[PDB]
């Protein structure tokens, strides 16, 4: 039992790390994940502004039409 | 060198979440910078949908 | 490398979770933040596609 | 045996521990790659309704 | 609620449109609309409701507003307010609800968007699993809706879909079909970097799914095809958990519970994953009786 | 700041619009206007001052302005510069600032989005929270604000404003208002694979309201019923911290602290959760008193 | 599908837009155009067949639509339906889909945004890895395409990118091409405080493509080099794995397959590592039977 | 690159816009410009050359249509394509990327965002820390910058510029200034959920500010300062560190690097705060020849 629960320590503790270097890739593909994203937020920041303003000026236009 | 790797093992494990915690945090971070970011596109995009359906009609009639 | 040298880690995995319970919350928003601007950002389209053919339709006696 | 049975049982808690941590990263790290698509349909969605008012803003000032 | 129902919904927001000179008029103008005018007066007084929070009143006001685009044929400008008759009447007649969305759709399908549409389509799938309980007519939306993500690229965002398609016909006993979906998804889950470690969840449930009556004594057949691919998703113990589940599968049923025992303790199981057990576990104890 | 206050705020940019030939004129022209005109030159009026840090006469400046578009009877063009009023007057008078956001919602209610709304109303709340503190208005903004979100599907953004109405009504003594927030928060939470893992901190700040001078005795009664629906929220020790809290409430009060002791080591306590267990710690010296 | 392939294709989408007038015609109008009547009548004609699933005989819809707007020499108005057949033609002849993305592109060259342009670049590449296997014409798309995101300075995402061109560029013994990669990655991963736990990911790829036949003498002038800047990537294990291959390198072969078995338990390599290895593998077995 | 230099460059892109008809002319058209036709032309012309990855070529054309625009007056047209010379020079001369950016910055000023400012204000003050290393001066382009963003209520988004120009500040000896942004910054992150758990990381280097050639004597009355509000960061060992080094100040100068033995083992320190410390071991051996 003692002898036993030692070498069940052993598949407990080898599963635990095992559970936490596995822990760890997805910890870092998050973070790669989430900064790639960030470039894709924004290009939508700076496209929404020319998604706004060149589109703006035809509002001022508007007085021709 | 059962109760070693035991140590041995619990010394890189605490040399991962040292660092687990670390990498984790940033992803704490990286979103709210993220959530700010959208919420600057969020009511531009509500305001760009609201300024061009005042211009459909003056371009409908028009 | 003892009971007190786990309890480092067994306080510290209890932050990782804390840390990440606030984490969830802050992504699952965001979820729902997109998928309402994907009906903002696409009505845009079909507000603007409307609006150029309607200004393809305004070029009248332009001679 | 009670100086591990004390102790042993108590890591089983910290492997319980874990696994609650471990389902919420692969969860999580799913959910932003279901977000990932998202935002991949708002960008070159942004990018049509960029050029259709760039079509209308050289357009509309004429 | 904000100033007395919002002025009483406005005093039924300024006398429900009427005096719009007949809503038609050929007299005066032949090159003309009122309808025009009769959109944005009629859309803020469905707004209106809103404030009000009284929402079966306010889609009823968006339909015809919807209505009234139609009648002017432009198309995307209706069915933009279809659904916001299809977000009102959800905290409302839930039928109303589905079926207005339901008209949405068609305005999207030959619009040019299919994303829209496929949102939408889990949308109304929505309604179907929480007030108006009816599982295989969700079944039949969310099938048809990851079709429209598959046809659109979106093959991550579609399984999110296409799991619910194949969760919900499990307890449906539709497991032929369904253990393909786990199927394809799991085998498209290990090319992947991002998945990988996610799909060892996806065969156990398709492991799962092959104990309709038959296959549990090949259950060995199941397992070395699953040992096939993807190195036994690299030996996690909830694939051992089947792996002693199969010398069970013959006698010494009472282990059923003791296999869980050490699993539910580890990981808490959902109430899917119980159910799915458990008729398993009704099943096993036809062994029992034929022990006797 | 940037050149002597941006040339002195452009020396009161421009002669504060003056020269506006009256700001009204009908002789020669009647189909015309200089009031847009008057838009852009008095808009980057007030933008010279967050350039100087002149943050009280920046919305100043904002307002006429955006007065001037509700002249001109343009609805969303003057609602998206009072928030930049509003944004201004943030670092400044405060009631000046909430008030003039308060004036951009109703622009905002009746044009087909309450998102944006319910941002605001939660901006007007974050100023009653650091700058006017004023706790029971702030509640009232909050409860507001989730009715738009929840009217707005979004029901998992809308708990983030309805936890706070919640966690700042319990200090006020509004416990039975806060304490069906918490449940119905996470009776909603377990359904979900999302906030599942979550859900077990609501709970235990739901049967901390359960304080109010009742129930106490039927804390029991609580957490059985805690019980019922999500299975001891797999049985989380938070939940046992409360399980030998409930023999504690009778007899050995120098205990409360020694319960804690062993709590807030494994997991510190924020200034919300000391103050409740606190309040409850001067309830139960009154039973300690009836000891004598 | 859908009502009988939607109406047979609704009836070849009324009758194949014949009875255009000639579809030219220039004896009433010199200045109008019965050709922007053929753009939605025949969109929306190939768009019919994605609901009855016919995605052959719909991109061959989309193409003469899209040859339409360049007949009409509206630039991108037939970019944006290129596209929708070369989205069309991917559960389909491929070789058709990627020649019509291929297409699409130089509009979008000379258009100004070259973002549009390097999402198809890897989206014509992905066909080249799953269809058309042809590896070596997908490196050169790659390629091309990180020069478009630098050039649009979005360094993150050229990364994601770059590593696919390395990653196949190492198993088609391109290594001196693709070492260079590895370090101009993780010299400009160790920089930034993201992606700094990743860099060391990258430079055990990077000296693991120091294994052509030459520099596994050198590994030592490899290591010493990759000593240099990142200290030891701070000295993980996963670089202690190549440490004790260094001596691994001369004698004892049998313990490589060791020295990766306490690594493959501790963390499951993927196909890609594998196979790098197992030719480092067959490289080792040269020094054993130089042995003999 | 891309058929030998883009066409050579397209042949200096249609012979460098010449042929312009002077550029200018008031005989036959009174109300017209050629100069818009100048634009897209001339605007095309540079993006040519980002095919050819001639950058220093590129952006000298992207700024005499900037000045086209501003020749033209019309305002949000200019702008945008000084930053595409500004994003073009990055990989050219950087002093012309600069100032080209700066005269990028006064244009969005007066326009009515400052979060486009603020972007480029670090962006400017990257090639001050990559290319052209002047410390001081991007010291002063990251503390305007911040002034942006709190100016736009990003209080978040400010503290990662706001970093920044405190993490400088500290080697360049600016203690007393940089010592008050850390203690703000945690001062502001102790009161949110969110950055609690890094508040830690940030009273850390503010204690570590306090080490000027002052105050490491009056270290106690530091850390008490650091007792006050955030109950010892709920005590990390990081700030225990400091604890024994406070002993550690007067006597035994050798267990310095003992003390970071057992600190850089646990957490391998980055070469900032490597630094910092090293510079306090060279100030405590002032007291080690005080020993003699």
């Given at each position: 039992?003692?002898?036993?629960?030692?070498?069940?320590?052993?598949?407990?503790?080898?599963?635990?790390?095992?559970?936490?270097?596995?822990?760890?890739?997805?910890?870092?593909?998050?973070?790669?994940?989430?900064?790639?994203?960030?470039?894709?937020?924004?290009?939508?920041?700076?496209?929404?502004?020319?998604?706004?303003?060149?589109?703006?000026?035809?509002?001022?236009?508007?007085?021709?039409? | 060198?059962?109760?070693?790797?035991?140590?041995?093992?619990?010394?890189?494990?605490?040399?991962?979440?040292?660092?687990?915690?670390?990498?984790?945090?940033?992803?704490?971070?990286?979103?709210?910078?993220?959530?700010?970011?959208?919420?600057?596109?969020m009511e531009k995009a509500d305001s760009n949908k609201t300024r061009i359906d005042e211009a459909n009609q003056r371009?409908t009639k028009? | 490398?003892?009971?007190?040298?786990?309890?480092?880690?067994?306080?510290?995995?209890?932050?990782?979770?804390?840390?990440?319970?606030?984490?969830?919350?802050?992504?699952?928003?965001?979820?729902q933040?997109?998928?309402e601007?994907?009906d903002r950002?696409?009505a845009?389209?079909?507000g603007?596609?409307?609006?150029?053919?309607?200004?393809?339709?305004?070029?009248?006696?332009?001679? | 045996?009670?100086?591990?049975?004390?102790?042993?049982?108590?890591?089983?808690?910290?492997?319980?521990?874990?696994?609650?941590?471990?389902?919420?990263?692969?969860?999580?790290?799913?959910?932003?790659?279901?977000?990932?698509?998202?935002?991949?349909?708002?960008?070159?969605?942004?990018?049509?309704?960029?050029?259709?008012?760039?079509?209308?803003?050289?357009?509309?000032?004429? | 609620s904000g100033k007395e129902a919002e002025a009483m919904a406005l005093l039924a927001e300024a006398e429900r449109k009427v005096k719009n000179s007949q809503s038609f008029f050929?007299?005066?103008?032949?090159?003309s609309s009122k309808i025009e005018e009769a959109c944005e007066i009629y859309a803020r007084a469905a707004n209106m409701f809103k404030m009000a929070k009284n929402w079966s009143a306010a889609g009823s006001a968006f339909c015809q507003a919807a209505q009234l685009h139609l009648q002017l044929?432009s198309?995307h400008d209706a069915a933009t307010c279809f659904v916001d008759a299809g977000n009102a009447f959800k905290k409302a007649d839930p039928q109303e609800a589905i079926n207005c969305l339901?008209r949405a759709?068609?305005?999207?399908?030959?619009?040019?968007?299919?994303?829209?549409?496929?949102?939408?389509?889990?949308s109304?799938?929505?309604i179907?699993?929480?007030e108006?309980?009816?599982?295989?007519?969700?079944?039949?939306?969310?099938?048809?809706?990851?079709?429209?993500?598959?046809?659109?690229?979106?093959?991550?965002?579609?399984?999110?879909?296409?799991?619910?398609?194949?969760?919900?016909?499990?307890?449906?006993?539709?497991?032929?079909?369904?253990?393909?979906?786990?199927?394809?998804?799991?085998?498209?889950?290990?090319?992947?970097?991002?998945?990988?470690?996610?799909?060892?969840?996806?065969?156990?449930?398709?492991?799962?799914?092959?104990?309709?009556?038959?296959?549990?004594?090949?259950?060995?057949?199941?397992?070395?095809?699953?040992?096939?691919?993807?190195?036994?998703?690299?030996?996690?113990?909830?694939?051992?958990?089947?792996?002693?589940?199969?010398?069970?599968?013959?006698?010494?049923?009472?282990?059923?519970?003791?296999?869980?025992?050490?699993?539910?303790?580890?990981?808490?199981?959902?109430?899917?994953?119980?159910?799915?057990?458990?008729?398993?576990?009704?099943?096993?104890?036809?062994?029992?009786?034929?022990?006797?």
């Open positions: 039992r003692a002898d036993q629960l030692a070498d069940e320590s052993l598949e407990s503790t080898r599963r635990m790390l095992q559970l936490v270097e596995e822990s760890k890739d997805a910890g870092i593909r998050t973070l790669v994940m989430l900064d790639e994203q960030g470039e894709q937020l924004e290009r939508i920041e700076e496209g929404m502004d020319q998604i706004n303003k060149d589109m703006k000026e035809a509002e001022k236009n508007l007085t021709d039409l | 060198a059962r109760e070693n790797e035991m140590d041995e093992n619990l010394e890189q494990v605490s040399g991962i979440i040292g660092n687990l915690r670390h990498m984790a945090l940033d992803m704490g971070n990286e979103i709210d910078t993220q959530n700010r970011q959208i919420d600057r596109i371009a028009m | 490398t003892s009971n007190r040298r786990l309890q480092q880690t067994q306080a510290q995995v209890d932050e990782v979770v804390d840390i990440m319970r606030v984490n969830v919350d802050k992504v699952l928003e965001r979820d933040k997109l998928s601007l994907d950002a696409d845009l389209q079909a603007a596609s409307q609006f150029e053919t309607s200004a393809a339709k305004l070029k009248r006696k332009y001679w | 045996l009670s100086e591990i049975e004390t102790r042993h049982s108590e890591i089983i808690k910290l492997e319980n521990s874990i696994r609650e941590l471990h389902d919420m990263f692969m969860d999580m790290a799913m959910l932003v790659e279901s977000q990932g698509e998202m935002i991949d349909r708002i960008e070159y969605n942004v990018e049509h309704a960029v050029d259709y008012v760039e079509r209308a803003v050289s357009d509309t000032k004429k | 050929s007299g005066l103008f032949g090159g044929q198309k339901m759709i068609e305005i999207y399908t030959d619009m040019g968007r299919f994303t829209i549409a496929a949102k939408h389509h889990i109304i799938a929505e179907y699993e929480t108006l309980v009816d599982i295989e007519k969700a079944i039949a939306h969310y099938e048809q809706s990851a079709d429209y993500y598959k046809g659109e690229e979106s093959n991550s965002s579609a399984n999110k879909c296409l799991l619910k398609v194949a969760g919900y016909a499990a307890q449906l006993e539709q497991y032929q079909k369904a253990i393909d979906i786990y199927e394809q998804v799991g085998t498209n889950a290990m090319d992947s970097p991002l998945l990988k470690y996610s799909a060892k969840d996806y065969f156990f449930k398709a492991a799962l799914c092959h104990f309709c009556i038959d296959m549990l004594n090949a259950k060995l057949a199941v397992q070395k095809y699953e040992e096939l691919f993807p190195a036994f998703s690299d030996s996690r113990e909830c694939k051992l958990m089947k792996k002693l589940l199969e010398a069970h599968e013959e006698q010494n049923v009472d282990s059923y519970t003791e296999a869980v025992k050490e699993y539910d303790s580890i990981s808490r199981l959902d109430q899917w994953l119980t159910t799915m057990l458990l008729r398993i576990k009704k099943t096993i104890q036809g062994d029992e009786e034929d022990l006797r």
